[PDB]
Amino acid sequence: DYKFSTLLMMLKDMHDSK
Amino acid sequence: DYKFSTLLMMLKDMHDSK
Amino acid sequence: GKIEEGKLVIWINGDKGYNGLAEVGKKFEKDTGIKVTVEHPDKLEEKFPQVAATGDGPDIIFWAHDRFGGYAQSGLLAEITPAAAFQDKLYPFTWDAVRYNGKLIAYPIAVEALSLIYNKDLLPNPPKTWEEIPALDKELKAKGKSALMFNLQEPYFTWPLIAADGGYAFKYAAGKYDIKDVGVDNAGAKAGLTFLVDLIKNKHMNADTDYSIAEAAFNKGETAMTINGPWAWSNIDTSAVNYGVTVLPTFKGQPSKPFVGVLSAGINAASPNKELAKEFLENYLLTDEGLEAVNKDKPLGAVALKSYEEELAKDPRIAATMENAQKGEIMPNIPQMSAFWYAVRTAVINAASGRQTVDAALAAAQTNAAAEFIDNVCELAARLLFSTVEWARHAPFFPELPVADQVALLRLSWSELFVLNAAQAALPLHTAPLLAERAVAFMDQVRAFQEQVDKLGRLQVDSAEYGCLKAIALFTPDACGLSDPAHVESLQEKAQVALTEYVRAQYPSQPQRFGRLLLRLPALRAVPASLISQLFFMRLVGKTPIETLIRDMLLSG
Amino acid sequence: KIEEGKLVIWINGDKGYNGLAEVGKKFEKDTGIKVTVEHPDKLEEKFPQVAATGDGPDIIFWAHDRFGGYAQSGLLAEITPAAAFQDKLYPFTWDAVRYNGKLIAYPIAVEALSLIYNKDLLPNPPKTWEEIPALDKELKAKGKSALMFNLQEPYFTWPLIAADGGYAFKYAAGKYDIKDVGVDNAGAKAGLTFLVDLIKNKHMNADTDYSIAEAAFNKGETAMTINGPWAWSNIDTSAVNYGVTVLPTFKGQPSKPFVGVLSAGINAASPNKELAKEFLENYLLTDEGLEAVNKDKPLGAVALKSYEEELAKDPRIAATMENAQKGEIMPNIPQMSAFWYAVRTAVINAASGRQTVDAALAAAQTNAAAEFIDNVCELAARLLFSTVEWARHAPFFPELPVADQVALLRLSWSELFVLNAAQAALPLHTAPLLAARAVAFMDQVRAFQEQVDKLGRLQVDSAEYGCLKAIALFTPDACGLSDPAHVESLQEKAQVALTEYVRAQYPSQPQRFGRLLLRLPALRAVPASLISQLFFMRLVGKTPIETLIRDMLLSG
Ligand SMILES: OC[C@H]1O[C@H](O[C@H]2[C@H](O)[C@@H](O)[C@@H](O)O[C@@H]2CO)[C@H](O)[C@@H](O)[C@@H]1O
Ligand SMILES: OC[C@H]1O[C@H](O[C@H]2[C@H](O)[C@@H](O)[C@@H](O)O[C@@H]2CO)[C@H](O)[C@@H](O)[C@@H]1O
């Protein structure tokens, strides 16, 4: 549904946990 | 001897004087 | 900027009678000493919300009522408060058109509806159905003439046909318009637009026709019929044509349903001359004398002023105007009407040119018109971002680059590729700016974003050209820290040569297409990468820059 | 006005004016001409002020650095000693007082700063500046400090700033380059940072000046100081048993003191030019004359060969000349006073804590170089006017409505300017670095330079520059343009013009046309604010060029 929004969120979080 | 510098200054003053 | 006090500046459309209105201004100036300047800027329905957002613009804005609810929502219009004695002078249903959330936001002036205008010497009996037209055109084509010519660029003029069989924009449900229920792609809407497109395929009509071509053609006697409003009657009067005004033809047995507008005058919320504007509008324009002055310049239609309407009503042309109005529908004044109008504008142009099919065009218009949520556009943009990265990764010669060079190229060019993808994918770019001082500057980049996408549409850039343009943007030597800048220049040249060979073969009649395509690239870089994040990805990635997220992807695998 | 029949002499107060007045008394005894010596405050500033009006002394004494400025201002008489007299003085001293091929002063003595140290409190002085902090800690526990020298005058701190790479004006092809100033390079920053670090760590106090340092050293409170030969007299009369040695090294490299040649110039307005010549040549510039001054306050290595051969045996003169050989003789060019004031402000602010070393030296760089004496901003200003006049006469532009003309130049003026700046080789590598958010500015400056380079490597000729300017000018991306289609067709005419040109002129480069067009996206990326920040901020301040350009276009 909001597939690529959540994809972008994951990229965000991964980057955040660095 | 700084001719176009003063030209530019006259444009500034002209504009400031409104 | 700011609005000058002690005078009145008025904006009215150029097809209306601004010279008659300026005469009323002279009468006002004579009695009060207040200068009234009437102006007819281009695209003023778009100009007014832009300039009035900054406290600028005219004191009085004239337009059909459908754009005023949006204006009032944005706080751009002063609420008018005429005494009951004045309101009694105007027909109640005209007041209804200019009421928004219980507040009168404009003075209604006249009711305008499209009619079938026909040349009585070339066509004593005009067709009662749209289906008779092609046979009539074939008969007339053999005499140096065409049957019908009307403006195909504005959807106002083609809506009557689209709506005839079932097209309906926004459904009126429980005493208010339902923004969820849009009727732009139902069976009836497809039927109407298909008939229109079929008239163009069969060379009974030309997709390029606009207002000027149609009016010139009719008034010169080259065509037997046109579709227009009362404002157009003046120029036929002065021309040689002996004409009639009648009911629009039916489609599939049903009346054409023109969208009816009420010419209205709103007072700018930032005007320091609100009392002057009220004085001018109530006591000078909305009078038998004031309206007659404007009507003799360009007919206004059925005027809202009862005393003057009773006389004009006896005019056969006004009777024809109201018959079409009664078969069509008074436009909603809700803010979402401009979205609707924009959606249907692009749909009809693409469908009539042959670029898209009828169903495809109206399908897109349906989503665009029907969208009170940015969740979908932000989802589309999010995918185009992933699509953009994956495109570059597999672009010829890119996978063989060192990864630092891959990152460097995408660091600069990702936003450019994104805009190209957004243009190619018809990303709907007309919505609020999600809410400063230079905010105005931010808004200008939004328009430069929109305008460049439009230029790419008007160029009719095809998929093969989009592929080349993306490669030319990707392999840019302007990137920083390339290990082999010469290698990237030769990669850009391969894409340049590829685009050269393509257009030379595919568009041999346009020898300057190659250059014209490259001339769109400078506007690509001007769209800042921060604007894309601000508009689509701020909610998802906050402060984090897209560039470093892309670097992650490239180094992820 | 200046009195005739006598001599008025101005010499600094740290010099031996009483010895010089003794030479004046001998001159008066032989000739009857009264000689009055005076030591006014800040006379290097006083002399040009009074001499501009035809007043002041007949003879002015100062280091040679301020004489080129004086001679430029017409304040100094050209001296004309016979060849026989000139041969009595070392040639390199005559070089110090030569300006545009004209000798403008008599050279007297070579002075350079040395490390002066107390032998009883420090038998072996530090070879490096880096030893000082540990030495100061050690000495502080005995009631004393390691080092105290004048921090108010940049003369005294320059040796350290220059050690690692600091320089004032680069010597290039036999002359000093006022465009190339070295006050904010890495080496200058390294030197000034060490000095400031000595103050932060309380090894030195920023308020120290000449009197505090000399009093401290001569009273035995500090182990070391930095001063010239003039200061030796007061140490002789004091209790201290002292040595004169090489200045310590910084980062392995010698300290580089700025070498001065004490010189005597004749006021251009003096009516006593011959008397002054007779005094200087036959009385002062003699073994006896110089000895009289030297016994008051030592002059250094004197320019007079016969007397320098005697003094040369002095270990302290040997130390003086060793330090001089590690430094450089100051330029005598007019811009030296700009330099000295610029660095003066830098060291005081940095040492007080007011500004950071980087900020302080950034400002000194601007002042010392003055935008190449503001010539670059002057060239840029001409290019700006050139840009407007170019567009106005560009084919098809004059026939546009004025609102469309304004709209086009509103967007494209900066691009046309950049094309003109590349064509005109406007110096951009100079990187003014004039601040008023950091890497970002610096990134766009590098993108500006790199695009101009790309235009060079393309070898864009004058004809192509004409076309590229037209293609950029007639852009439909401008806002508010009546008939945008007309402008598209004008851009196409320019596009076709470039196509026809390159096909004919460079047939072996079939890709040159598109290649040239691919330089345009970088033209738009150069922000107009960057152009103003680097060239026009001083002239138009906050005002945006766009507004000013509209005025130019719609002025006439
Ligand atoms: O076609 C879209 C357009 O339709 C209406 O504009 C009409 C206007 O009401 C008429 O008075 C006349 O000027 O023709 C216009 C279309 O050519 C809507 O009022 C407008 O908001 C909408 O964009
Ligand atoms: O401090 C900058 C200053 O340096 C030189 O002045 C020296 C002078 O050469 C010495 O003889 C002695 O008087 O100390 C001065 C520094 O206090 C330059 O001659 C002078 O122009 C410059 O301002």
PDB file of N, CA, C and O in Angstrom, chain D residues 436-470:
ATOM      1  N   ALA D 436      31.045  37.751   5.349  1.00  0.00           N
ATOM      2  CA  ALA D 436      30.312  38.904   5.869  1.00  0.00           C
ATOM      3  C   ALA D 436      29.252  38.483   6.894  1.00  0.00           C
ATOM      4  O   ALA D 436      28.887  37.307   6.993  1.00  0.00           O
ATOM      5  N   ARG D 437      27.078  26.330   5.032  1.00  0.00           N
ATOM      6  CA  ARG D 437      27.208  27.766   5.221  1.00  0.00           C
ATOM      7  C   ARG D 437      28.652  28.208   5.061  1.00  0.00           C
ATOM      8  O   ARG D 437      28.929  29.399   4.944  1.00  0.00           O
ATOM      9  N   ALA D 438      29.577  27.250   5.044  1.00  0.00           N
ATOM     10  CA  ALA D 438      30.977  27.600   4.843  1.00  0.00           C
ATOM     11  C   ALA D 438      31.576  26.755   3.734  1.00  0.00           C
ATOM     12  O   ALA D 438      31.992  27.282   2.695  1.00  0.00           O
ATOM     13  N   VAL D 439      31.629  25.439   3.961  1.00  0.00           N
ATOM     14  CA  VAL D 439      31.968  24.502   2.896  1.00  0.00           C
ATOM     15  C   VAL D 439      31.064  24.742   1.699  1.00  0.00           C
ATOM     16  O   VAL D 439      31.498  24.668   0.543  1.00  0.00           O
ATOM     17  N   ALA D 440      29.783  25.016   1.965  1.00  0.00           N
ATOM     18  CA  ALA D 440      28.824  25.277   0.897  1.00  0.00           C
ATOM     19  C   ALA D 440      29.274  26.439   0.022  1.00  0.00           C
ATOM     20  O   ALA D 440      29.363  26.308  -1.205  1.00  0.00           O
ATOM     21  N   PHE D 441      29.541  27.598   0.632  1.00  0.00           N
ATOM     22  CA  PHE D 441      30.117  28.708  -0.123  1.00  0.00           C
ATOM     23  C   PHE D 441      31.380  28.268  -0.858  1.00  0.00           C
ATOM     24  O   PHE D 441      31.528  28.502  -2.064  1.00  0.00           O
ATOM     25  N   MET D 442      32.292  27.608  -0.137  1.00  0.00           N
ATOM     26  CA  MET D 442      33.543  27.135  -0.725  1.00  0.00           C
ATOM     27  C   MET D 442      33.299  26.128  -1.838  1.00  0.00           C
ATOM     28  O   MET D 442      34.083  26.047  -2.792  1.00  0.00           O
ATOM     29  N   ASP D 443      32.251  25.314  -1.714  1.00  0.00           N
ATOM     30  CA  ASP D 443      31.959  24.362  -2.775  1.00  0.00           C
ATOM     31  C   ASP D 443      31.561  25.085  -4.049  1.00  0.00           C
ATOM     32  O   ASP D 443      32.057  24.765  -5.135  1.00  0.00           O
ATOM     33  N   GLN D 444      30.699  26.096  -3.924  1.00  0.00           N
ATOM     34  CA  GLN D 444      30.256  26.838  -5.095  1.00  0.00           C
ATOM     35  C   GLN D 444      31.382  27.659  -5.701  1.00  0.00           C
ATOM     36  O   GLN D 444      31.413  27.856  -6.919  1.00  0.00           O
ATOM     37  N   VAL D 445      32.313  28.140  -4.879  1.00  0.00           N
ATOM     38  CA  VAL D 445      33.476  28.834  -5.421  1.00  0.00           C
ATOM     39  C   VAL D 445      34.304  27.884  -6.280  1.00  0.00           C
ATOM     40  O   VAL D 445      34.741  28.243  -7.378  1.00  0.00           O
ATOM     41  N   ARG D 446      34.505  26.651  -5.809  1.00  0.00           N
ATOM     42  CA  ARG D 446      35.258  25.669  -6.588  1.00  0.00           C
ATOM     43  C   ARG D 446      34.511  25.273  -7.858  1.00  0.00           C
ATOM     44  O   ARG D 446      35.127  25.073  -8.913  1.00  0.00           O
ATOM     45  N   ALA D 447      33.184  25.134  -7.771  1.00  0.00           N
ATOM     46  CA  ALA D 447      32.386  24.854  -8.958  1.00  0.00           C
ATOM     47  C   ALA D 447      32.458  26.000  -9.957  1.00  0.00           C
ATOM     48  O   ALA D 447      32.457  25.772 -11.172  1.00  0.00           O
ATOM     49  N   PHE D 448      32.537  27.231  -9.457  1.00  0.00           N
ATOM     50  CA  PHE D 448      32.718  28.389 -10.321  1.00  0.00           C
ATOM     51  C   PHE D 448      34.046  28.292 -11.067  1.00  0.00           C
ATOM     52  O   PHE D 448      34.083  28.385 -12.300  1.00  0.00           O
ATOM     53  N   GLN D 449      35.145  28.078 -10.329  1.00  0.00           N
ATOM     54  CA  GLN D 449      36.467  27.932 -10.943  1.00  0.00           C
ATOM     55  C   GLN D 449      36.513  26.761 -11.921  1.00  0.00           C
ATOM     56  O   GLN D 449      37.093  26.877 -13.008  1.00  0.00           O
ATOM     57  N   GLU D 450      35.939  25.617 -11.532  1.00  0.00           N
ATOM     58  CA  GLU D 450      36.037  24.410 -12.348  1.00  0.00           C
ATOM     59  C   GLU D 450      35.284  24.561 -13.667  1.00  0.00           C
ATOM     60  O   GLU D 450      35.724  24.044 -14.702  1.00  0.00           O
ATOM     61  N   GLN D 451      34.141  25.251 -13.649  1.00  0.00           N
ATOM     62  CA  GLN D 451      33.402  25.460 -14.887  1.00  0.00           C
ATOM     63  C   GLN D 451      34.183  26.335 -15.858  1.00  0.00           C
ATOM     64  O   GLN D 451      34.195  26.073 -17.067  1.00  0.00           O
ATOM     65  N   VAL D 452      34.825  27.389 -15.349  1.00  0.00           N
ATOM     66  CA  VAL D 452      35.644  28.252 -16.197  1.00  0.00           C
ATOM     67  C   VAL D 452      36.790  27.457 -16.817  1.00  0.00           C
ATOM     68  O   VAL D 452      37.124  27.629 -17.999  1.00  0.00           O
ATOM     69  N   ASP D 453      37.404  26.568 -16.027  1.00  0.00           N
ATOM     70  CA  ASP D 453      38.436  25.678 -16.550  1.00  0.00           C
ATOM     71  C   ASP D 453      37.887  24.814 -17.677  1.00  0.00           C
ATOM     72  O   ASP D 453      38.520  24.674 -18.734  1.00  0.00           O
ATOM     73  N   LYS D 454      36.709  24.218 -17.464  1.00  0.00           N
ATOM     74  CA  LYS D 454      36.103  23.393 -18.501  1.00  0.00           C
ATOM     75  C   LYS D 454      35.896  24.195 -19.779  1.00  0.00           C
ATOM     76  O   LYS D 454      36.090  23.677 -20.885  1.00  0.00           O
ATOM     77  N   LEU D 455      35.551  25.477 -19.647  1.00  0.00           N
ATOM     78  CA  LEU D 455      35.410  26.308 -20.834  1.00  0.00           C
ATOM     79  C   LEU D 455      36.760  26.503 -21.514  1.00  0.00           C
ATOM     80  O   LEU D 455      36.846  26.484 -22.747  1.00  0.00           O
ATOM     81  N   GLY D 456      37.827  26.662 -20.722  1.00  0.00           N
ATOM     82  CA  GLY D 456      39.168  26.725 -21.287  1.00  0.00           C
ATOM     83  C   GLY D 456      39.561  25.460 -22.029  1.00  0.00           C
ATOM     84  O   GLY D 456      40.062  25.518 -23.156  1.00  0.00           O
ATOM     85  N   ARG D 457      39.356  24.299 -21.399  1.00  0.00           N
ATOM     86  CA  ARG D 457      39.725  23.034 -22.029  1.00  0.00           C
ATOM     87  C   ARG D 457      38.931  22.785 -23.301  1.00  0.00           C
ATOM     88  O   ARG D 457      39.424  22.123 -24.222  1.00  0.00           O
ATOM     89  N   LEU D 458      37.693  23.288 -23.364  1.00  0.00           N
ATOM     90  CA  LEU D 458      36.928  23.264 -24.605  1.00  0.00           C
ATOM     91  C   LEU D 458      37.525  24.179 -25.665  1.00  0.00           C
ATOM     92  O   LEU D 458      37.208  24.019 -26.850  1.00  0.00           O
ATOM     93  N   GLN D 459      38.367  25.135 -25.265  1.00  0.00           N
ATOM     94  CA  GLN D 459      38.909  26.147 -26.172  1.00  0.00           C
ATOM     95  C   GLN D 459      37.777  26.870 -26.897  1.00  0.00           C
ATOM     96  O   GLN D 459      37.777  27.019 -28.121  1.00  0.00           O
ATOM     97  N   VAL D 460      36.786  27.297 -26.108  1.00  0.00           N
ATOM     98  CA  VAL D 460      35.669  28.075 -26.627  1.00  0.00           C
ATOM     99  C   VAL D 460      36.208  29.375 -27.206  1.00  0.00           C
ATOM    100  O   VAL D 460      36.849  30.161 -26.498  1.00  0.00           O
ATOM    101  N   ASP D 461      35.920  29.626 -28.489  1.00  0.00           N
ATOM    102  CA  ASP D 461      36.412  30.820 -29.159  1.00  0.00           C
ATOM    103  C   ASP D 461      35.420  31.977 -29.007  1.00  0.00           C
ATOM    104  O   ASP D 461      34.339  31.842 -28.424  1.00  0.00           O
ATOM    105  N   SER D 462      35.821  33.150 -29.501  1.00  0.00           N
ATOM    106  CA  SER D 462      34.995  34.343 -29.347  1.00  0.00           C
ATOM    107  C   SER D 462      33.639  34.176 -30.026  1.00  0.00           C
ATOM    108  O   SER D 462      32.628  34.688 -29.532  1.00  0.00           O
ATOM    109  N   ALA D 463      33.608  33.531 -31.197  1.00  0.00           N
ATOM    110  CA  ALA D 463      32.336  33.334 -31.886  1.00  0.00           C
ATOM    111  C   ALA D 463      31.397  32.440 -31.085  1.00  0.00           C
ATOM    112  O   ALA D 463      30.193  32.705 -31.000  1.00  0.00           O
ATOM    113  N   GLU D 464      31.927  31.372 -30.494  1.00  0.00           N
ATOM    114  CA  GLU D 464      31.086  30.474 -29.711  1.00  0.00           C
ATOM    115  C   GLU D 464      30.584  31.168 -28.449  1.00  0.00           C
ATOM    116  O   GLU D 464      29.419  31.000 -28.062  1.00  0.00           O
ATOM    117  N   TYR D 465      31.439  31.975 -27.812  1.00  0.00           N
ATOM    118  CA  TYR D 465      31.003  32.755 -26.657  1.00  0.00           C
ATOM    119  C   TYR D 465      29.834  33.671 -27.016  1.00  0.00           C
ATOM    120  O   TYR D 465      28.904  33.843 -26.219  1.00  0.00           O
ATOM    121  N   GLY D 466      29.866  34.272 -28.208  1.00  0.00           N
ATOM    122  CA  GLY D 466      28.738  35.077 -28.645  1.00  0.00           C
ATOM    123  C   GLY D 466      27.461  34.267 -28.748  1.00  0.00           C
ATOM    124  O   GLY D 466      26.399  34.699 -28.291  1.00  0.00           O
ATOM    125  N   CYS D 467      27.550  33.067 -29.324  1.00  0.00           N
ATOM    126  CA  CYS D 467      26.364  32.229 -29.451  1.00  0.00           C
ATOM    127  C   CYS D 467      25.883  31.756 -28.082  1.00  0.00           C
ATOM    128  O   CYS D 467      24.692  31.862 -27.761  1.00  0.00           O
ATOM    129  N   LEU D 468      26.803  31.251 -27.254  1.00  0.00           N
ATOM    130  CA  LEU D 468      26.422  30.756 -25.937  1.00  0.00           C
ATOM    131  C   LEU D 468      25.754  31.843 -25.108  1.00  0.00           C
ATOM    132  O   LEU D 468      24.781  31.574 -24.396  1.00  0.00           O
ATOM    133  N   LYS D 469      26.248  33.083 -25.196  1.00  0.00           N
ATOM    134  CA  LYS D 469      25.591  34.176 -24.487  1.00  0.00           C
ATOM    135  C   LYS D 469      24.170  34.393 -24.995  1.00  0.00           C
ATOM    136  O   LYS D 469      23.265  34.712 -24.216  1.00  0.00           O
ATOM    137  N   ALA D 470      23.956  34.259 -26.307  1.00  0.00           N
ATOM    138  CA  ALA D 470      22.614  34.449 -26.847  1.00  0.00           C
ATOM    139  C   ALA D 470      21.687  33.304 -26.456  1.00  0.00           C
ATOM    140  O   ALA D 470      20.514  33.533 -26.130  1.00  0.00           O
TER     141      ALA D 470
END
